[PDB]
Amino acid sequence: DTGLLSGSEERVQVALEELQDLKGVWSELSKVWEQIDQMKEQPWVSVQP
Amino acid sequence: DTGLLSGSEERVQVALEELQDLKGVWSELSKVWEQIDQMKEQPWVSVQPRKLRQNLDALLNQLKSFPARLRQYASYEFVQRLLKGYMKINMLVIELKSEALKDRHWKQLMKRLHVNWVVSELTLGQIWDVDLQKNEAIVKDVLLV
């Protein structure tokens, strides 16, 4: 037994929290990307602004 | 004792079953005419005549999936004859994407069709409103020129 590396534990904690944050971010960005891709698949010449 | 007319409630439950059947029929018809609305309001920016034929056959086959009681209703005959009568967009609408479309060609067609137009949003929702099988003669003259 010895002094456990609390730096490793806090690194794991911050990795987990930033991972969940970025997972939500990527979900939102994927939704934005798919909607804008569906918008741009059509020429949009005669569709009102 | 008060012997009541049970035939009243038998008719009630028969009408309830018919009501549920009609509710299903009209839910399917609501889906059908919602698809009709999307293929209507489309300003003809990406749709092709082959896509119109695909939509026609898709609507026909999903309609023909009605069961016996749902297929024999008058509304089924109405929608089926409507689809058969419109079984027509691909035939005439090959004029807009052609090079023959221009400002005065739009003007002469707009005089022939007698409706008013806005150039910015060229929506087929009003193009089809002037039914093509009804005014085929004038548009063909607009075509032929």
Coordinates of N, CA and C in Angstrom, one line a residue:
Chain A
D1 N 0.8 -1.2 0.0 CA 0.0 0.0 0.0 C 0.9 1.2 0.0
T2 N 0.5 2.3 -0.7 CA 1.2 3.5 -0.8 C 0.2 4.6 -1.2
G3 N 0.7 5.8 -1.3 CA -0.1 6.9 -1.7 C -0.5 6.8 -3.2
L4 N -1.8 6.5 -3.4 CA -2.3 6.3 -4.7 C -2.3 7.6 -5.5
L5 N -2.1 7.4 -6.8 CA -1.9 8.6 -7.7 C -3.3 9.2 -7.9
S6 N -3.6 10.2 -7.1 CA -4.9 11.0 -7.3 C -4.9 11.7 -8.6
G7 N -3.7 12.0 -9.1 CA -3.7 12.6 -10.5 C -4.3 11.7 -11.5
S8 N -4.0 10.4 -11.4 CA -4.6 9.5 -12.4 C -6.1 9.4 -12.2
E9 N -6.6 9.5 -11.0 CA -8.0 9.4 -10.7 C -8.7 10.6 -11.3
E10 N -8.2 11.8 -11.0 CA -8.8 13.0 -11.5 C -8.7 13.1 -13.1
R11 N -7.6 12.6 -13.6 CA -7.5 12.5 -15.1 C -8.6 11.6 -15.6
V12 N -8.9 10.5 -15.0 CA -10.0 9.6 -15.4 C -11.3 10.3 -15.3
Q13 N -11.5 11.0 -14.2 CA -12.8 11.8 -14.0 C -13.0 12.8 -15.0
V14 N -11.9 13.6 -15.3 CA -12.1 14.7 -16.3 C -12.3 14.1 -17.7
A15 N -11.6 13.0 -18.0 CA -11.8 12.3 -19.2 C -13.2 11.8 -19.4
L16 N -13.8 11.3 -18.3 CA -15.2 10.8 -18.4 C -16.1 11.9 -18.6
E17 N -16.0 13.0 -17.8 CA -16.9 14.1 -18.0 C -16.8 14.8 -19.3
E18 N -15.6 15.0 -19.8 CA -15.4 15.6 -21.1 C -15.9 14.7 -22.2
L19 N -15.8 13.4 -22.0 CA -16.3 12.4 -22.9 C -17.8 12.5 -23.1
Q20 N -18.5 12.5 -21.9 CA -19.9 12.7 -22.0 C -20.3 14.0 -22.6
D21 N -19.6 15.1 -22.3 CA -19.9 16.4 -22.9 C -19.7 16.3 -24.4
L22 N -18.6 15.8 -24.9 CA -18.3 15.7 -26.3 C -19.2 14.7 -27.0
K23 N -19.7 13.7 -26.3 CA -20.7 12.8 -26.9 C -22.0 13.6 -27.2
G24 N -22.5 14.4 -26.2 CA -23.6 15.2 -26.5 C -23.4 16.2 -27.6
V25 N -22.2 16.8 -27.6 CA -21.8 17.7 -28.6 C -21.8 17.0 -30.0
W26 N -21.3 15.8 -30.1 CA -21.3 15.1 -31.4 C -22.7 14.7 -31.8
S27 N -23.6 14.4 -30.9 CA -24.9 14.1 -31.2 C -25.6 15.3 -31.8
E28 N -25.4 16.5 -31.2 CA -26.0 17.7 -31.7 C -25.4 18.1 -33.1
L29 N -24.0 17.9 -33.2 CA -23.4 18.2 -34.5 C -23.8 17.3 -35.6
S30 N -24.0 16.0 -35.2 CA -24.5 15.1 -36.2 C -25.9 15.4 -36.7
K31 N -26.7 15.8 -35.8 CA -28.1 16.2 -36.2 C -28.0 17.5 -37.1
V32 N -27.1 18.4 -36.8 CA -27.0 19.6 -37.6 C -26.4 19.2 -39.0
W33 N -25.4 18.3 -39.0 CA -24.8 17.9 -40.2 C -25.8 17.2 -41.1
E34 N -26.6 16.3 -40.6 CA -27.5 15.5 -41.4 C -28.6 16.5 -41.9
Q35 N -29.1 17.4 -41.1 CA -30.1 18.3 -41.6 C -29.6 19.2 -42.7
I36 N -28.4 19.7 -42.5 CA -27.9 20.6 -43.6 C -27.5 19.8 -44.8
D37 N -27.1 18.6 -44.7 CA -26.8 17.8 -45.9 C -28.1 17.5 -46.6
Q38 N -29.2 17.2 -45.9 CA -30.5 17.0 -46.6 C -30.9 18.3 -47.2
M39 N -30.7 19.4 -46.6 CA -31.0 20.7 -47.3 C -30.2 20.9 -48.6
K40 N -28.9 20.6 -48.5 CA -28.1 20.9 -49.7 C -28.1 19.8 -50.8
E41 N -28.7 18.6 -50.5 CA -28.9 17.6 -51.5 C -29.7 18.1 -52.7
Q42 N -30.7 19.0 -52.4 CA -31.5 19.6 -53.4 C -30.9 20.9 -53.9
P43 N -31.0 21.3 -55.2 CA -30.4 22.5 -55.7 C -31.0 23.8 -54.9
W44 N -32.2 23.8 -54.5 CA -32.9 24.9 -53.9 C -32.8 26.2 -54.8
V45 N -33.5 26.1 -55.9 CA -33.5 27.2 -56.8 C -34.9 27.9 -56.8
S46 N -35.9 27.1 -56.7 CA -37.3 27.6 -56.7 C -38.0 27.4 -55.3
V47 N -37.2 27.1 -54.3 CA -37.7 27.0 -52.9 C -37.5 28.3 -52.2
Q48 N -38.5 28.9 -51.6 CA -38.5 30.3 -51.1 C -37.4 30.4 -50.0
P49 N -36.8 31.6 -49.9 CA -35.7 31.8 -48.9 C -36.3 31.7 -47.4
Chain B
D1 N -89.2 -4.9 -15.4 CA -89.0 -5.7 -16.6 C -88.5 -4.9 -17.7
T2 N -89.3 -3.8 -18.1 CA -88.9 -2.8 -19.1 C -88.1 -3.5 -20.3
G3 N -88.8 -4.4 -21.0 CA -88.2 -5.0 -22.1 C -87.9 -4.0 -23.2
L4 N -86.6 -3.8 -23.4 CA -86.1 -2.7 -24.3 C -85.8 -3.3 -25.7
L5 N -85.6 -2.4 -26.7 CA -85.3 -2.8 -28.0 C -83.7 -2.9 -28.1
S6 N -83.3 -4.2 -27.9 CA -81.9 -4.5 -28.0 C -81.3 -4.3 -29.4
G7 N -82.2 -4.3 -30.4 CA -81.7 -4.0 -31.8 C -81.1 -2.7 -31.9
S8 N -81.6 -1.7 -31.1 CA -80.9 -0.4 -31.1 C -79.5 -0.5 -30.7
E9 N -79.1 -1.2 -29.7 CA -77.7 -1.3 -29.3 C -76.9 -2.2 -30.2
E10 N -77.6 -3.2 -30.8 CA -76.9 -4.0 -31.8 C -76.5 -3.1 -33.0
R11 N -77.4 -2.3 -33.5 CA -77.1 -1.3 -34.5 C -76.0 -0.4 -34.0
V12 N -76.0 0.0 -32.7 CA -75.0 0.9 -32.1 C -73.6 0.2 -32.3
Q13 N -73.5 -1.0 -31.9 CA -72.2 -1.7 -31.9 C -71.8 -2.0 -33.4
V14 N -72.7 -2.3 -34.2 CA -72.4 -2.5 -35.7 C -71.8 -1.2 -36.2
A15 N -72.5 -0.1 -35.9 CA -72.1 1.2 -36.4 C -70.7 1.6 -35.8
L16 N -70.5 1.2 -34.5 CA -69.2 1.4 -33.9 C -68.0 0.7 -34.6
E17 N -68.3 -0.6 -35.0 CA -67.3 -1.4 -35.8 C -67.1 -0.7 -37.1
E18 N -68.2 -0.3 -37.8 CA -68.0 0.4 -39.1 C -67.3 1.7 -38.9
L19 N -67.5 2.4 -37.8 CA -66.8 3.6 -37.5 C -65.3 3.4 -37.3
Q20 N -64.9 2.4 -36.6 CA -63.5 2.1 -36.5 C -62.9 1.7 -37.8
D21 N -63.6 0.9 -38.6 CA -63.1 0.6 -40.0 C -62.9 1.8 -40.8
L22 N -63.9 2.8 -40.8 CA -63.8 4.0 -41.5 C -62.6 4.9 -40.9
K23 N -62.4 4.8 -39.6 CA -61.3 5.6 -39.0 C -60.0 5.0 -39.6
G24 N -59.8 3.7 -39.7 CA -58.6 3.2 -40.3 C -58.5 3.5 -41.8
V25 N -59.6 3.5 -42.5 CA -59.6 3.8 -43.9 C -59.2 5.3 -44.1
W26 N -59.7 6.2 -43.3 CA -59.4 7.6 -43.4 C -58.0 7.9 -42.9
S27 N -57.5 7.1 -41.9 CA -56.0 7.3 -41.5 C -55.1 7.0 -42.7
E28 N -55.4 5.9 -43.4 CA -54.7 5.5 -44.6 C -54.8 6.5 -45.7
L29 N -56.1 7.0 -45.9 CA -56.3 8.1 -46.9 C -55.6 9.4 -46.5
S30 N -55.5 9.7 -45.2 CA -54.8 10.9 -44.8 C -53.3 10.7 -45.1
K31 N -52.7 9.6 -44.9 CA -51.3 9.3 -45.3 C -51.2 9.5 -46.8
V32 N -52.2 8.9 -47.6 CA -52.1 9.0 -49.0 C -52.2 10.4 -49.5
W33 N -53.1 11.2 -49.0 CA -53.2 12.6 -49.4 C -52.2 13.5 -48.8
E34 N -51.5 13.1 -47.7 CA -50.3 13.8 -47.3 C -49.2 13.6 -48.2
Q35 N -49.0 12.4 -48.7 CA -48.0 12.1 -49.8 C -48.4 12.9 -51.0
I36 N -49.7 13.0 -51.3 CA -50.1 13.8 -52.4 C -49.8 15.3 -52.2
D37 N -49.9 15.7 -51.0 CA -49.5 17.1 -50.7 C -48.1 17.4 -50.9
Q38 N -47.2 16.4 -50.5 CA -45.8 16.6 -50.7 C -45.4 16.6 -52.2
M39 N -46.0 15.7 -52.9 CA -45.7 15.7 -54.4 C -46.5 16.8 -55.1
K40 N -47.4 17.5 -54.4 CA -48.1 18.7 -54.9 C -47.2 20.0 -54.7
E41 N -46.9 20.3 -53.5 CA -46.2 21.5 -53.1 C -44.8 21.6 -53.6
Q42 N -44.2 20.4 -54.0 CA -42.9 20.4 -54.5 C -42.7 21.4 -55.7
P43 N -41.7 22.3 -55.6 CA -41.6 23.3 -56.7 C -40.9 22.8 -57.9
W44 N -40.7 21.4 -58.1 CA -40.1 20.8 -59.2 C -38.6 21.3 -59.3
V45 N -37.9 21.1 -58.3 CA -36.4 21.4 -58.3 C -35.6 20.2 -58.4
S46 N -36.0 19.1 -57.8 CA -35.2 17.8 -57.9 C -36.0 16.6 -58.4
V47 N -37.3 16.7 -58.4 CA -38.1 15.5 -58.8 C -38.0 15.3 -60.3
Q48 N -38.0 14.0 -60.7 CA -37.9 13.6 -62.1 C -39.2 12.9 -62.5
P49 N -39.5 12.9 -63.8 CA -40.6 12.1 -64.3 C -40.6 10.7 -63.8
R50 N -39.5 10.0 -63.8 CA -39.4 8.7 -63.2 C -39.8 8.6 -61.8
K51 N -39.4 9.7 -61.0 CA -39.8 9.8 -59.6 C -41.3 9.9 -59.5
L52 N -41.9 10.7 -60.4 CA -43.4 10.8 -60.4 C -44.0 9.5 -60.6
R53 N -43.5 8.7 -61.6 CA -44.1 7.4 -61.9 C -43.9 6.5 -60.7
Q54 N -42.7 6.6 -60.0 CA -42.5 5.8 -58.8 C -43.5 6.1 -57.7
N55 N -43.8 7.4 -57.5 CA -44.7 7.8 -56.5 C -46.1 7.3 -56.9
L56 N -46.5 7.4 -58.2 CA -47.8 6.9 -58.6 C -47.9 5.4 -58.3
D57 N -46.9 4.6 -58.7 CA -47.1 3.1 -58.4 C -47.0 2.8 -57.0
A58 N -46.2 3.5 -56.2 CA -46.1 3.3 -54.8 C -47.5 3.6 -54.1
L59 N -48.1 4.7 -54.5 CA -49.4 5.0 -53.9 C -50.5 4.0 -54.4
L60 N -50.4 3.5 -55.6 CA -51.3 2.5 -56.1 C -51.2 1.2 -55.3
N61 N -49.9 0.8 -55.1 CA -49.8 -0.5 -54.4 C -50.1 -0.4 -52.9
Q62 N -49.8 0.7 -52.3 CA -50.1 0.8 -50.9 C -51.7 0.9 -50.7
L63 N -52.3 1.5 -51.7 CA -53.8 1.6 -51.7 C -54.4 0.2 -51.9
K64 N -53.8 -0.6 -52.8 CA -54.4 -1.9 -53.1 C -54.1 -2.9 -52.0
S65 N -53.3 -2.5 -51.0 CA -53.1 -3.3 -49.8 C -54.3 -3.3 -48.8
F66 N -55.3 -2.6 -49.2 CA -56.5 -2.5 -48.3 C -57.2 -3.9 -48.2
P67 N -57.6 -4.3 -47.0 CA -58.3 -5.5 -46.8 C -59.7 -5.5 -47.5
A68 N -60.4 -6.6 -47.5 CA -61.6 -6.7 -48.3 C -62.7 -5.7 -47.9
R69 N -63.0 -5.5 -46.6 CA -64.0 -4.5 -46.2 C -63.4 -3.1 -46.5
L70 N -62.2 -2.9 -46.2 CA -61.6 -1.5 -46.5 C -61.4 -1.3 -48.0
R71 N -61.3 -2.3 -48.8 CA -61.1 -2.1 -50.2 C -62.4 -1.8 -50.9
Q72 N -63.5 -2.3 -50.4 CA -64.8 -2.2 -51.1 C -65.6 -0.9 -50.8
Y73 N -65.0 0.0 -49.9 CA -65.7 1.2 -49.6 C -65.6 2.2 -50.8
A74 N -66.6 3.1 -50.7 CA -66.7 4.1 -51.8 C -65.5 5.0 -51.9
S75 N -64.9 5.4 -50.7 CA -63.7 6.2 -50.7 C -62.6 5.5 -51.4
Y76 N -62.4 4.2 -51.3 CA -61.4 3.5 -52.0 C -61.6 3.6 -53.5
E77 N -62.8 3.5 -54.0 CA -63.1 3.7 -55.4 C -62.7 5.1 -55.8
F78 N -63.1 6.1 -55.0 CA -62.8 7.4 -55.3 C -61.3 7.7 -55.4
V79 N -60.5 7.2 -54.5 CA -59.0 7.5 -54.5 C -58.4 6.7 -55.7
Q80 N -58.9 5.4 -55.9 CA -58.3 4.6 -57.0 C -58.6 5.2 -58.3
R81 N -59.8 5.7 -58.6 CA -60.1 6.3 -59.8 C -59.4 7.7 -60.0
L82 N -59.2 8.4 -58.9 CA -58.4 9.6 -58.9 C -56.9 9.3 -59.4
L83 N -56.3 8.3 -58.8 CA -55.0 7.9 -59.1 C -54.9 7.4 -60.6
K84 N -55.9 6.6 -61.0 CA -55.9 6.2 -62.4 C -56.1 7.3 -63.4
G85 N -56.9 8.3 -63.0 CA -57.0 9.5 -63.9 C -55.8 10.3 -63.9
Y86 N -55.0 10.4 -62.8 CA -53.8 11.1 -62.8 C -52.6 10.1 -63.1
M87 N -52.9 8.9 -63.5 CA -51.8 7.9 -63.9 C -51.2 8.3 -65.2
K88 N -50.0 11.6 -64.7 CA -49.9 12.3 -66.0 C -48.9 13.4 -65.9
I89 N -48.3 13.6 -64.7 CA -47.3 14.7 -64.5 C -46.1 14.5 -65.4
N90 N -45.6 13.3 -65.5 CA -44.4 13.1 -66.3 C -44.6 13.4 -67.8
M91 N -45.8 13.4 -68.3 CA -46.1 13.5 -69.7 C -45.9 15.0 -70.1
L92 N -46.4 16.0 -69.3 CA -46.4 17.4 -69.7 C -45.3 18.2 -69.1
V93 N -44.9 17.8 -67.8 CA -44.0 18.7 -67.0 C -42.6 18.7 -67.6
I94 N -42.4 17.9 -68.7 CA -41.1 18.1 -69.3 C -41.3 19.2 -70.3
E95 N -41.3 20.4 -69.7 CA -41.2 21.7 -70.4 C -40.4 22.7 -69.5
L96 N -40.4 22.5 -68.2 CA -39.9 23.5 -67.2 C -38.3 23.4 -67.2
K97 N -37.8 22.2 -67.1 CA -36.4 22.0 -67.1 C -35.8 22.0 -68.5
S98 N -36.6 22.1 -69.5 CA -36.1 22.3 -70.9 C -35.6 23.7 -71.1
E99 N -34.8 23.9 -72.2 CA -34.3 25.2 -72.5 C -35.4 26.1 -73.0
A100 N -36.5 25.6 -73.4 CA -37.6 26.4 -73.9 C -38.3 27.3 -72.9
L101 N -38.0 27.1 -71.6 CA -38.5 28.0 -70.6 C -37.8 29.3 -70.6
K102 N -38.5 30.4 -70.6 CA -38.0 31.8 -70.5 C -39.1 32.7 -70.1
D103 N -38.7 34.0 -70.0 CA -39.6 35.0 -69.4 C -40.9 35.1 -70.2
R104 N -40.8 35.3 -71.6 CA -42.1 35.5 -72.3 C -42.8 34.1 -72.5
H105 N -42.0 33.0 -72.6 CA -42.7 31.7 -72.6 C -43.5 31.5 -71.3
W106 N -42.9 32.0 -70.2 CA -43.7 32.0 -68.9 C -44.9 32.9 -69.1
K107 N -44.7 34.1 -69.8 CA -45.8 35.0 -69.9 C -47.0 34.5 -70.8
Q108 N -46.6 33.9 -71.9 CA -47.6 33.3 -72.8 C -48.4 32.2 -72.2
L109 N -47.7 31.3 -71.4 CA -48.3 30.3 -70.7 C -49.2 30.8 -69.6
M110 N -48.7 31.9 -68.9 CA -49.5 32.5 -67.8 C -50.8 33.1 -68.4
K111 N -50.7 33.7 -69.6 CA -52.0 34.2 -70.2 C -52.9 33.0 -70.6
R112 N -52.3 31.9 -71.1 CA -53.1 30.8 -71.5 C -53.8 30.1 -70.3
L113 N -53.0 30.0 -69.2 CA -53.6 29.4 -68.0 C -54.4 30.3 -67.2
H114 N -54.3 31.6 -67.5 CA -55.2 32.7 -66.9 C -54.9 32.9 -65.4
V115 N -54.0 32.1 -64.8 CA -53.7 32.3 -63.4 C -52.6 33.3 -63.3
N116 N -52.3 33.8 -62.0 CA -51.2 34.7 -61.8 C -50.1 34.0 -61.1
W117 N -48.9 34.5 -61.3 CA -47.7 33.8 -60.8 C -46.7 34.7 -60.1
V118 N -45.9 34.1 -59.2 CA -44.7 34.8 -58.7 C -43.5 34.1 -59.1
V119 N -42.5 34.8 -59.7 CA -41.4 34.1 -60.3 C -40.5 33.5 -59.3
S120 N -40.3 34.1 -58.1 CA -39.4 33.6 -57.1 C -39.6 32.2 -56.7
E121 N -40.9 31.9 -56.3 CA -41.2 30.5 -55.8 C -42.1 29.9 -56.9
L122 N -41.5 29.1 -57.8 CA -42.2 28.4 -58.9 C -42.6 27.0 -58.3
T123 N -43.7 27.0 -57.6 CA -44.2 25.8 -57.0 C -45.2 25.1 -57.9
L124 N -45.0 23.8 -58.0 CA -46.0 23.0 -58.8 C -47.3 22.8 -58.1
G125 N -47.4 23.2 -56.8 CA -48.7 23.2 -56.1 C -49.7 24.1 -56.8
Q126 N -49.3 25.1 -57.5 CA -50.2 25.9 -58.3 C -50.2 25.5 -59.8
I127 N -49.1 24.9 -60.2 CA -49.1 24.3 -61.6 C -50.1 23.2 -61.7
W128 N -50.1 22.3 -60.8 CA -51.1 21.2 -60.8 C -52.5 21.7 -60.5
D129 N -52.6 22.8 -59.8 CA -53.9 23.3 -59.5 C -54.7 23.6 -60.8
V130 N -53.9 24.1 -61.8 CA -54.5 24.2 -63.2 C -54.2 22.8 -63.8
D131 N -55.2 21.9 -63.7 CA -55.1 20.5 -64.0 C -54.7 20.3 -65.5
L132 N -53.6 19.5 -65.7 CA -53.0 19.4 -67.0 C -53.9 18.7 -68.0
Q133 N -54.6 17.6 -67.5 CA -55.5 16.8 -68.4 C -56.8 17.6 -68.7
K134 N -57.0 18.7 -68.0 CA -58.1 19.6 -68.3 C -57.8 20.6 -69.3
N135 N -56.6 21.2 -69.3 CA -56.1 22.2 -70.2 C -55.0 21.7 -71.1
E136 N -55.1 20.4 -71.5 CA -54.0 19.8 -72.3 C -53.9 20.6 -73.7
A137 N -55.0 21.0 -74.3 CA -54.9 21.6 -75.6 C -54.1 22.9 -75.6
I138 N -54.4 23.8 -74.6 CA -53.7 25.1 -74.7 C -52.2 24.9 -74.3
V139 N -51.9 24.1 -73.3 CA -50.5 23.9 -72.9 C -49.7 23.2 -74.1
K140 N -50.3 22.3 -74.8 CA -49.7 21.7 -75.9 C -49.4 22.7 -77.0
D141 N -50.3 23.7 -77.2 CA -50.0 24.8 -78.1 C -48.9 25.6 -77.5
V142 N -48.8 25.8 -76.2 CA -47.7 26.4 -75.5 C -46.5 25.5 -75.7
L143 N -46.6 24.2 -75.6 CA -45.5 23.3 -76.0 C -45.1 23.5 -77.4
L144 N -46.0 23.2 -78.3 CA -45.7 23.1 -79.8 C -44.9 24.4 -80.2
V145 N -45.3 25.5 -79.7 CA -44.5 26.7 -80.0 C -43.1 26.7 -79.3

